[PDB]
Amino acid sequence: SPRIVQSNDLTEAAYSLSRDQKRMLYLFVDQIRKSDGICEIHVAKYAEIFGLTSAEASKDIRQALKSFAGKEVVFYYESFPWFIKPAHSPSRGLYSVHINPYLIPFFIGRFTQFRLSETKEITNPYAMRLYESLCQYRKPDGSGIVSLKIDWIIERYQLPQSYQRMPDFRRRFLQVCVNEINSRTPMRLSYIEKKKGRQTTHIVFSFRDI
DNA sequence: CCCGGACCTGTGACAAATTGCCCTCAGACGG
DNA sequence: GGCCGTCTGAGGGCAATTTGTCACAGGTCCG
Ligand SMILES: [Mg+2]
Ligand SMILES: [Mg+2]
Ligand SMILES: [Mg+2]
Ligand SMILES: [Mg+2]
Ligand SMILES: [Mg+2]
Ligand SMILES: [Mg+2]
């Protein structure tokens, strides 16, 4: 199945995208890499890749596409818009898109890799972000261990403000996304909290492959 | 000493958003 | 040649779940 590769700078960028937008973003990076920034998406293929009907595929593409407007990406810092022209459809079932050509060197560079089947059943976009960050440290055999700082997670993944309260961070982000990864990917993941005084400061992730 | 106060945790409620489903009808194509 | 039946997808919706927010119960240590 398709092997996604991406620069760590994208793995670690600050941005806010939905699941459907992130799904589309994987094919663009795939299209770009197999070679101006102009990409294309076919409704009937998207539906087959992600096990959707044509109707619901059309809905996902149309709404993802119109929600890119105004979205910006920050590399730590430097900000860019993802698109420099609205999307548009020349043919029935076909969409054409214009990625900011200045984003090319950030996609292709110190890199992150995974096959697309690893991520296509994850639902929560923050769990997609976390799984991409763990892959960045994965070893050939399939295991790894990394300590991520809580403030950096909140900035990079652009978590909403109520997750600055640690019990809400635990309940609605960490536990849920560790549970998805363990149920929906081939990775088996555990973690432990690092503290300093009363504040919890980092999360230490260990994982191996099934 | 005990207190009020500034920290921390977890849970019950409720509001806002997202999920996979369902139904309609015209476009593109070929037999 | 040209009409029509089928495969698509572009629309309009839905209720059941999940995600985002905040009040209050309950712990510690400080001055
Ligand atoms: Mg979202
Ligand atoms: Mg959808
Ligand atoms: Mg403190
Ligand atoms: Mg008393
Ligand atoms: Mg009680
Ligand atoms: Mg008290």
Residue the block writes with tokens 């430097």: A78
Answer for A198: CB within 7 Å of strand B.
yes
Q: Please state the length of chain A.
A: 210
Sequence spans of domains, chain A: 1-120, 121-210
Cα four-point dihedral sign A34, A39, A40, A41:
positive
Cα distance between residue A34 and residue A55, in whole Å: 29
C-alpha closest to that of A10 among A25, A27, A31: A25
Dist. CA A168 → ligand 5 center (Å): 22
Method of elucidation: X-ray
Instruction: Give the bases of strand B that a protein CB approaches within 7 Å.
Output: 7-11, 18-24, 27-28
Q: Give one DSSP letter per residue of chain A, joined into a string.
A: --EEEEEHHHHT-B----HHHHHHHHHHHHHHH----EEEEEHHHHHHHTT--HHHHHHHHHHHHHT-TT-EEEE--EEEESBSS--B-SSTTEEEEEB-GGGHHHH---EEEEEGGGTTT--SHHHHHHHHHHHTT--TTS-EEEEEEHHHHHHHTT--GGGGSHHHHIIIIIHHHHHHHHHHSSEEEEEEEEEETTEEEEEEEEEEE-
Q: Do residues A137 and A188 touch, judged by C-beta distance below 8 A?
A: no
Following DSSP, what letter does each residue of A60-88 receive, concatenated? HHHHHHHT-TT-EEEE--EEEESBSS--B
What residues are paired with A149 via a beta bridge?
Answer: A202
The token duo for A35 is 């070679």
- List Cβ<8 Å contacts ≥24 apart for A135-143: A135/A11, A136/A8, A136/A11, A136/A12, A136/A112, A138/A207, A141/A209, A142/A187, A142/A208, A142/A209, A143/A206, A143/A207, A143/A208, A143/A209
User: A158: CA distance to ligand 1 center in Å?
Assistant: 10
Ligand nearest, relative to CA of residue A21: 1
Give distance in angstroms: CA of A2 to centre of ligand 4: 65
